[PDB]
DNA sequence: TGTGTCAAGTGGCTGT
DNA sequence: ACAGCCACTTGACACA
């Protein structure tokens, strides 16, 4: 029973996950455990900052 | 001296 | 039947 400690990823890695947000909106299956490979964070570590760049975006011009 | 932030987790609806 | 964002809060932690 892991305790959800927080986890970060290096400002490297998440250059790179700027760079797939700010190109696409969308990542599918095969391009998005790529950017997962490259940095080494897992799959599910990319989809989720991925969900998080869309509801910010949009909420921020509601704002 | 405590929140807001961050990423996850949660929780709830509609297509295909 | 199928499968998963889309938006609210928690659940630890960086900010000052």
């Known amino acids: 029973k892991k305790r959800k400690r927080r986890v970060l990823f ?3 890695q998440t250059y790179e ?3 797939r947000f700010r ?3 969308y990542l ?3 391009e998005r455990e ?3 490979s490259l940095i080494r964070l897992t799959p599910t570590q990319v989809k989720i900052w ?3 760049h ?3 975006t949009k909420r921020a011009q509601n704002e």
Do not use: W
Request: charge should be positive; charged fraction near 30%; hydrophobic fraction near 30%.
């Open 50 to 52: 991925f969900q998080n």
């Open 34 to 36: 790529h950017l997962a």
């Open 23 to 25: 190109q696409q909106r």
């Open 28 to 30: 599918s299956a095969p």
């Open 54 to 56: 869309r509801y910010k």
């Open 17 to 19: 996950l700027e760079r």
């Open 10 to 12: 290096t400002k490297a």
